[PDB]
A paper describes a structure:
The HA glycoprotein on the viral surface is responsible for cell entry and is the main focus of the humoral immune response.
The Cα190-OH98 distances in HK68 WT (Glu190), HK68 E190D, Wy03 WT (Asp190), and Wy03 D190E are around 9.0–9.7 Å, whereas this distance in Fin04, HK05, Vic11, and Mich14 is around 8.5–8.8 Å. Relative to the WT HAs, the mutants bound more weakly or not at all to the array, but when binding was observed, specificity for human-type (α2–6) receptors was strongly maintained.
Residue numbers in the entry:
A (entry chain A): 9 to 329
B (entry chain E), C (entry chain C): 9 to 325
Amino acid sequence: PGATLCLGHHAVPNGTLVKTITDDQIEVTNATELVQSSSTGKICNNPHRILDGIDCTLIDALLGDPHCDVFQNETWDLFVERSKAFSNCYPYDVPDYASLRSLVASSGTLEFITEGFTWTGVTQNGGSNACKRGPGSGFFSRLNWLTKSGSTYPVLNVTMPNNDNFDKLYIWGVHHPSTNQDQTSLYVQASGRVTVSTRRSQQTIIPNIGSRPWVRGLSSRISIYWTIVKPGDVLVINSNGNLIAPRGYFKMRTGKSSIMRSDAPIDTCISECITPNGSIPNDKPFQNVNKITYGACPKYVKQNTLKLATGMRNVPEKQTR
Amino acid sequence: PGATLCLGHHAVPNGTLVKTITDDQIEVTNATELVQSSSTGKICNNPHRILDGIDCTLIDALLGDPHCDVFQNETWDLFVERSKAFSNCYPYDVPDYASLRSLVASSGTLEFITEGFTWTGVTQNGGSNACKRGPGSGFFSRLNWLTKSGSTYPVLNVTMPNNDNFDKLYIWGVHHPSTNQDQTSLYVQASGRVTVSTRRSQQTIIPNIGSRPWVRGLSSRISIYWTIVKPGDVLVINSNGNLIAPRGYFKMRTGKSSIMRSDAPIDTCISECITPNGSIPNDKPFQNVNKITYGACPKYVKQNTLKLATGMRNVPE
Amino acid sequence: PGATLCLGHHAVPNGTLVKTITDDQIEVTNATELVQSSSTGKICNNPHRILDGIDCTLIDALLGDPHCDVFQNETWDLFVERSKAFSNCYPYDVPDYASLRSLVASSGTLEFITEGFTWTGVTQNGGSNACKRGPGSGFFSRLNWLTKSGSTYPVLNVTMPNNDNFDKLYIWGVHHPSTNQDQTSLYVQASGRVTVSTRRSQQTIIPNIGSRPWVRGLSSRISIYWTIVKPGDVLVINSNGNLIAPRGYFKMRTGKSSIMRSDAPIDTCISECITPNGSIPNDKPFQNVNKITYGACPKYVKQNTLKLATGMRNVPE
Ligand SMILES: *[C@@H]1O[C@H](CO)[C@@H](O[C@@H]2O[C@H](CO)[C@@H](O[C@@H]3O[C@H](CO)[C@@H](O)[C@H](O[C@H]4O[C@H](CO)[C@@H](O)[C@H](O)[C@@H]4O)[C@@H]3O)[C@H](O)[C@H]2NC(C)=O)[C@H](O)[C@H]1NC(C)=O
Ligand SMILES: *[C@@H]1O[C@H](CO)[C@@H](O[C@@H]2O[C@H](CO)[C@@H](O[C@@H]3O[C@H](CO[C@H]4O[C@H](CO)[C@@H](O)[C@H](O)[C@@H]4O)[C@@H](O)[C@H](O)[C@@H]3O)[C@H](O)[C@H]2NC(C)=O)[C@H](O)[C@H]1NC(C)=O
Ligand SMILES: *[C@@H]1O[C@H](CO)[C@@H](O[C@@H]2O[C@H](CO)[C@@H](O[C@@H]3O[C@H](CO)[C@@H](O)[C@H](O)[C@@H]3O)[C@H](O)[C@H]2NC(C)=O)[C@H](O)[C@H]1NC(C)=O
Ligand SMILES: *[C@@H]1O[C@H](CO)[C@@H](O[C@@H]2O[C@H](CO)[C@@H](O[C@@H]3O[C@H](CO)[C@@H](O)[C@H](O)[C@@H]3O)[C@H](O)[C@H]2NC(C)=O)[C@H](O)[C@H]1NC(C)=O
Ligand SMILES: *[C@@H]1O[C@H](CO)[C@@H](O[C@@H]2O[C@H](CO)[C@@H](O)[C@H](O)[C@H]2NC(C)=O)[C@H](O)[C@H]1NC(C)=O
Ligand SMILES: *[C@@H]1O[C@H](CO)[C@@H](O[C@@H]2O[C@H](CO)[C@@H](O)[C@H](O)[C@H]2NC(C)=O)[C@H](O)[C@H]1NC(C)=O
Ligand SMILES: *[C@@H]1O[C@H](CO)[C@@H](O)[C@H](O)[C@H]1NC(C)=O
Ligand SMILES: *[C@@H]1O[C@H](CO)[C@@H](O)[C@H](O)[C@H]1NC(C)=O
Ligand SMILES: *[C@@H]1O[C@H](CO)[C@@H](O)[C@H](O)[C@H]1NC(C)=O
Ligand SMILES: *[C@@H]1O[C@H](CO)[C@@H](O)[C@H](O)[C@H]1NC(C)=O
Ligand SMILES: *[C@@H]1O[C@H](CO)[C@@H](O)[C@H](O)[C@H]1NC(C)=O
């Protein structure tokens, strides 16, 4: 009478199906999920500095639309723009809006430094009932609407050197009156011109008189432009009418700052990865929540699930049942 | 006296070469090709709706060049532009031609809806011998060349709101006369201007008087522009000369439509994948026919062959 | 009396650590490095034709800034621009500088063919003290500053057909005077205009009078533009002032040419792969030296080391 010694391995009652080279479905004892497919629905307020735009786009906060005044000098890692945002100042357009929004978002700051521009022979601080600031007419806080003084608008020719060791961003504009009467009444000259230049570059804009769609009482518009002045360079502004002047410059920075469109609420929690759907955990290497992300995030993939086997092949005893 | 039992495997006299981790060439009993390297030379007319441009580019069909009038309100999944296509109307350019072509191709339709623009104090329906319709002069069917009425061209100022639930594409233009005499003769004012705007954006174009190369009798030109008006927005057009006015809008869609340059003939057959060389089968995961494709297609790779082994190592006798 | 026969494998006293699927560090008898992480610090002058820009950008050599005259008709596989480069001619800007630089770099040649343009009723060969050529005033060698003759500047209207079988690149410009007095003094007319066109395209530029920052004595500027004329097409130039005329065309080519910013010295040696840090060997499949490369190069990766095992597991003792 001898003895029997059998070698074997475990099995479990409920295995999981995984994919391999040779099988699209085969059963193993256990597996783990590699795709993050859910979010909290909330943007965590740490560890990144989140700035909720509320009723304001970044551009409106930049220009200084009065209901956006609370954003003066703000900073962010991620500026969050809401679908409820609205403009409530002079109607405007920005040629290459997308680029201005991008470069400001990336700079991470609206830090503004006022400069002593000398505008000889014109009236400063023009305002409109389309841009109410308290009970009276007003204007974008960072811009200076220049108009005639007495019976003249002389050729403006002013300079501002950059003697600092950082880049200066200047935001300026051009006023497009609705009629010839408006043009001559504001600027004397029948056709204006704005030329803004540095040593190496220049932009010249001719205003265009005529009607655009009525917005807050006005068929006129302002067009917004920008100019970056590097250390050792100089800004020159030259105009015989229709200039919407800068009051100063924004300080440019580089770093980790960006902007996101989302309606998710901001909550008190901690998450490295942010999507427009809300924050997601980053323990998994892949995610199917949103291709738009900010921070340390899993890579976006199209699959909603991918199972990595964490055990052997599951081979139950055949039952006659 | 015992017995011998030998274990073995098959072989064939002529195997096939495959690549592995350790070998560039190793012989196995069988393999299958993973790169589609051939085409029929023909574009199959199913299952995608193919519209052959013949003598017309998509942009000429859009503007309404007279030899392209047969394309009015046509639709497609894939518009096919031929190298023989030509223009035969007023000479024009489109700044950002590529974008206009792309967005129209993608919309998949030339469906045009006329709108009642009121152009007070100007003559409508200008024509040219460069763009013949029948025995007379003519013009692009979707555009309205405005000129002076009597001795004046007043400031034109019109509006058109978008109260529908779809995007409206408006095509319009600016006329660049060859001389000052032409400018004043057509528009009275010595310098024109066209401003087309919505609530949030605007384009302003100043025409430029002078000669360009002679095309069908003319050194003048038209420049073509577009404006998309979304639901709830409004179009305003403002001009004191040189406006080539829209007659209406094109109804925009989104979906699977595109455009391809090809000279391959269209045939009656079925193929999911189309290239400029013709349709290709899509049973293989890769293809080396053309990086330009439309439909359910193998991915383009640089290799002209890649063999997947479907059998063991071949060790012949 | 029997015998013992033991089967075994080698080991080495100091192995190397490698990564696998299951281990981030495991010891094998030998490995080899797959990431090139160092450079000579020098650009090898073979087998690619290297052209050192020295004090000149490609654009300054193109326009013909006098200290760049030595580059006339030069050719290259790789043009090397140095951080010490400076301009020393009329102050200028190029809208879409990056595109002009790219297309010229890619063409690989500054081969220039002078053409007999007829500029009726104007003075040719204008110069400035901002662009000295020898002791006296001068200008970009490939451009022709036109000004009034006597008391008039007539409308210029000239043509040049492309009857060759290659593409022609024309470089031209527009002068922006500092004051109204400068404008009328040079061109008579109070406002100029430059229109340069082919059959299919056109550019029209309005000059802008006013001050820019002082550079070499001047608050005026020149703006530089380009036009490519294909075989069978025609160039037309039309202007009533402010034109900086082409003297001819550059011959366009296609091929392997490019441009790189680098301060590495050029040396007599052989290397297929060039980076701004200098040439690197290309025996390894990957490199972490610089994402900017030219030639037959390893692919840029973020890792500074990756070890491929070239032996078994090392089990010492
Ligand atoms: C160029 O053409 C356009 C289109 O014809 C034209 O724009 C239109 O002008 C009128 C008059 O200014 C605008 O009417 C306003 O519309 C809003 C509704 O959105 C109303 O709130 C306004 O009502 C107040 O203002 C009136 C005074 O004008 C009062 O009578 C009234 O009691 C209210 O206080 C008013 O109806 C209309 O919106 C625009 N339309 C567009 C699309 O812009 C423009 O004026 C023309 N230009 C010239 C120079 O003629
Ligand atoms: C500005 O200068 C331009 C250059 O001189 C002037 O344009 C020229 O104007 C003349 C006469 O008005 C045109 O001549 C006609 O052109 C065609 C030729 O077209 C082409 O086709 C034929 C084949 O049919 C071919 O042989 C030619 O090579 C052309 O390619 C003829 O059919 C007519 O009989 C006649 O010759 C010139 O073509 C035209 N040239 C260009 C490049 O535009 C322009 O008039 C001047 N502007 C002003 C205001 O004076
Ligand atoms: C078989 O695989 C599954 C994963 O697919 C294993 O279940 C997971 O087990 C881990 C811990 O081993 C759980 O994580 C823990 O979560 C709690 C809070 O829920 C946290 O406080 C702990 O610090 C820890 O992170 C995880 O939730 C769980 N996940 C799921 C989806 O079940 C399971 O343990 C494996 N079985 C065997 C026998 O190994
Ligand atoms: C518009 O305003 C600007 C700034 O006030 C004027 O530009 C300035 O013009 C002066 C010449 O009057 C330049 O000075 C020169 O500097 C060099 C050395 O840098 C010196 O060697 C010369 O002797 C000369 O004094 C000054 O640099 C320049 N400023 C800038 C920023 O470029 C411009 O002339 C005004 N124009 C009109 C028409 O009002
Ligand atoms: C995260 O948000 C995205 C964006 O809203 C969701 O995906 C979209 O949902 C629409 C239907 O409303 C689908 O047809 C599209 O596939 C998605 N749109 C876009 C523009 O990508 C997504 O479901 C959300 N995911 C989670 C987990 O909440
Ligand atoms: C090759 O040159 C590049 C470009 O200057 C060097 O990269 C810089 O060096 C360190 C990190 O390596 C940083 O402080 C700089 O910001 C880097 N600049 C850029 C533009 O990447 C690189 O180190 C050099 N490599 C070798 C091997 O010499
Ligand atoms: C913004 O910051 C600058 C300097 O850092 C300061 O002078 C300025 O007054 C600040 N503005 C506001 C609104 O706090
Ligand atoms: C080789 O493999 C293919 C694909 O599996 C198969 O269709 C073919 O019949 C096989 N040929 C032979 C000779 O076994
Ligand atoms: C397809 O057309 C392209 C582009 O004309 C050509 O280079 C390629 O060789 C063609 N290939 C086949 C398989 O017909
Ligand atoms: C490792 O690799 C090469 C041979 O491929 C040789 O020069 C070197 O001596 C080897 N080193 C060791 C420790 O085996
Ligand atoms: C430039 O190109 C050719 C030389 O092949 C010739 O027409 C011309 O004289 C050359 N000029 C110079 C300066 O070398």
